[PDB]
Design a protein around this ligand. Structure first.
Ligand code: CL
Ligand code: CL
Length: 162
């Protein structure tokens, strides 16, 4: 298991524009297109991301390419974030993947806002962090996914994904 396989399980793969859990236009492997209600605006962003007239439909290769870019961007985002970087550097490889998953889902800003949980993670207080992470809108809105990521931080193993 690795970050790619993990995210692929959490996000799924859809070759057409779809609406995410929050009702936002997305395509491929969790690639958010726009928060705007306009399908046209979404099609426009998709075309601009892929570099062709897609008509809202992409190929598997195209989806994977957006995916690789997005994973890369999440990692680079964490390393440039003063609040995230120290946490990330303190963690082991498995837990690092868990932090990347959160950033991919909710953005750097969103995750950086989990002040208390971040501090607990940095301190290696696993059970405590897991409890604190669960007191959030994130957990209440996407509980199965949140549980998988939380277990990952709690145990440092991939058990939740096997
Ligand atoms: Cl893009
Ligand atoms: Cl869920």
């Amino acid at each position: 298991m690795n970050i790619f396989e993990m995210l692929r399980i959490d996000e799924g793969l859809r070759l057409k524009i779809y609406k995410d859990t929050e009702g936002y236009y997305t395509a491929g492997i969790g690639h958010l297109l726009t928060k705007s209600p306009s399908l046209n605006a979404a099609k426009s962003e998709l075309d601009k991301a892929i570099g062709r007239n897609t008509n809202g439909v992409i190929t598997k290769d195209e989806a994977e390419k957006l995916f690789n870019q997005d994973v890369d961007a999440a990692v680079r985002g964490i390393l440039r974030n003063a609040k995230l970087k120290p946490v990330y550097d303190s963690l082991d490889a498995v837990r690092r993947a868990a932090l990347i998953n959160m950033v991919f889902q909710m953005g750097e800003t969103g995750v950086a806002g989990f002040t208390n949980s971040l501090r607990m993670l940095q301190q290696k207080r696993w059970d405590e962090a897991a409890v604190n992470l669960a007191k959030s809108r994130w957990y209440n809105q996407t509980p199965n996914r949140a549980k998988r990521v939380i277990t990952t931080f709690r145990t440092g193993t991939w058990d939740a994904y096997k």
